[PDB]
Amino acid sequence: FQGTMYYGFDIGGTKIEFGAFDADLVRVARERVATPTESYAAFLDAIVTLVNNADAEFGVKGTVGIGIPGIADVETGKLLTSNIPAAMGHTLQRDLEERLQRPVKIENDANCFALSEAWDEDLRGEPSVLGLILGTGVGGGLIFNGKVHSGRANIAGEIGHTRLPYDALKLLGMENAPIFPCGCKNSGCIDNYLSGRGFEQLYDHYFSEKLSAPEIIAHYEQGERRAVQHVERFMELLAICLANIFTCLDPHVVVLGGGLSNFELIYQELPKRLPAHLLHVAKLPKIIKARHGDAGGVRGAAFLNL
Amino acid sequence: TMYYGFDIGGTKIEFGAFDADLVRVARERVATPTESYAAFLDAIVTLVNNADAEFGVKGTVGIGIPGIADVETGKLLTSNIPAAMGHTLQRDLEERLQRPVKIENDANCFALSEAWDEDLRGEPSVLGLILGTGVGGGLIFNGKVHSGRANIAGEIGHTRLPYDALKLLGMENAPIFPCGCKNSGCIDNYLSGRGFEQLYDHYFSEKLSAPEIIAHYEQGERRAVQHVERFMELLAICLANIFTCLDPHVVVLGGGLSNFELIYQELPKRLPAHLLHVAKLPKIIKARHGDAGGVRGAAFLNL
C-alpha cells in the first residue's frame, strides 16, 4: 500500500499545476492541465480530473490542498479572484468537497508560496518572511515566527489591492499617470502595475505597442531605447512601491515568485534603488528569488494537509 | 522590584512605576524638552532619580520613543523630535543611570500592552495605531510584537499617501506636506493630530488646533464640518489600504486624536467602500488603558 499521498494544486489564470507528495514529502507526481476560464463546471472538471487520475495511478485517495489567486470568504467560502472573473463568487471548497467526496483545504496562492518557501531550513528560523508573487497579479504571503498570518478575513498580504503611493504616481507623471482599472473594481491598485501583466500594460501605455514581458526584456537586453526607458521606469516604480510596503512590514527576508521574478535585473537594481525611498535607519531585507522555482504554490497547498 | 516605564511624547514625557504585582504606584508627567538634547536627556534622568529616591530602590528602565533606534548603531530617528535625532539614547542613559535600559518604539509598546488585555488574549493579530504628533503602528501576531528587520515594523506614518487619498485631496492640487523623515507626502503629516490641523489650515487659512476644529465641528460650523468629512474619508481610505495589506483582527487606536469619538462611528461606515468585497471589518476599539498603554508596554519590556 502506497500510504498517505498529499495533493497540492496551484491554480493560475492559464494552467493548473498539480503535485502529489508521498509520505516522505517526495514529489511523485507533476501535472499541468489547461485552466478552463470559460465554464466553472469545467474549471471544477479540470481539478477533479487531476485528483481522480492521480487516485487511480497510485491507488489511493489523496488529501487535497488548493492554492488560488484570490480569497475564499471567511464566512461564506465564496471566492474573490480578481484576475479570474470565471471563478468569482463560487463556493469552491464545498463544490470540490461534493465532487471529490472528501475534505478540501483552500488557501491563497501567495500564502502557500510563502509558507513553503519559509519552511525551508534557511528561513524557518527567520522572525519574518514576506513571499511576493509578481505574476498575472501581485500577491503576498506573510510569515511571522514561522506561522502564516492569514488575517481577519484571509486578506493578509493582499498588497496587490493597495493603491499606488504618491511617490510612484509622481514618477509616472502625477495627473498624467496611467490609472489602470482593477479586477477588484477599484482603480490604481498596484496589481495592475508590478505584475508581469502590469509591466506589459505600462509599456503599451507609454509606447503604443502590445509587446509581451519576455519580448520587452529581450529588447532591453539589446539596449533598445524604448525598452531601456521602460525598464528604468519599472525598476524605480518597483523600488518605490516595495519601499512603502517595507516601511509598513519591515520583513527580514523577501522571496519573489511568479513569472516576473525570473527577471534577474530585479535582484541587482532593488538594493541600489530602495535606500532612497526607505527611512534613514532602515536596513535592507535579504531579497531572494524563489528557492522552489515555480513549485512553491503547489508544495504549500499540498502541505496545508500536513 | 520596581519597573519603570517611560512613554516619550511629541508634547510630554509620561512616567510610570509598577510594583512587583504590576500595580501602578507612580505617575509623573513632564513636558518633553525638545529644544536641547541635554534637556531631553535631563528630564528622563530626573524622573528616574526622583522615583528612585521616593521608593528607595533602583528600578528597571523601559522606554517607548516616538521613533526608531537604529538596529546597528543605536542612534535615534525621531521624525517629530529633531532634538533627539542621531543620539545613542540607550547607551547615553545607561551611562547617566548606571543600569541597563530597554528602548522600543512607542506604538509597539502601546500595542503590546493593549494586546495583552484579557479581552484580546487569543486574537491572532492586533494592530495598535497612534494618531498623535505623528502616526505610528505596533504589530502584534499571536501575542508577540513584530519589530521588523530594522525596528521599522509598523512605521505606517512613513508610507506615502495612496492614489485614492490623493484623488480625494485634489490630485495635482493636493497639499504635499514635507516629513520629518525628509520624504514628502508621508501619511504621518496627514492623519496625526498635527496632520488634521495642517489639512485644516491648508484648506481654510486659519491655524486652529485640533480640539478647536473639533469643537467647531460639534457646533455644526461650515468649515469644520467640511474638514471633518474630508478627514474621515481620508482616514478611511488610508486605513483601508493598510488593512488590505495587514488584515488585522483588532485595531486599537491611541494618541490625542483617538479621543475624537466620531472616528469609531465613521470608520466602520466608510471603510467597506475601499476594502475588498470579501473583507470583514476588524474590531476597531479605543485604547483600553487610556493614555497609559505606552508607559505600561515600556515598563513591561523588563518583565
Ligand SMILES: CC(=O)N[C@@H]1[C@@H](O)[C@H](O)[C@@H](COP(=O)(O)O)O[C@H]1O
Ligand atoms: C483579491 C485578489 O484577487 N488578489 C490576487 C491575489 O490574491 C493573488 O495572490 C495575486 C497573485 O496571483 P497570480 O498567481 O499572479 O494570478 O493576484 C491578486 O490579484
Ligand SMILES: CC(=O)N[C@@H]1[C@@H](O)[C@H](O)[C@@H](COP(=O)(O)O)O[C@H]1O
Ligand atoms: C520615523 C519616525 O520618527 N516615526 C514615528 C513613529 O515611530 C511613532 O510611533 C509615531 C507616533 O509618535 P507620537 O506619539 O505621535 O509622537 O510618529 C512617527 O512619526
Ligand SMILES: [Cl-]
Ligand atoms: Cl504627541
Ligand SMILES: [K+]
Ligand atoms: K495573501
Ligand SMILES: [K+]
Ligand atoms: K512601530
Ligand SMILES: [Zn+2]
Ligand atoms: Zn484591486
Ligand SMILES: [Zn+2]
Ligand atoms: Zn520584438
Ligand SMILES: [Zn+2]
Ligand atoms: Zn516620513
Ligand SMILES: [Zn+2]
Ligand atoms: Zn474657535
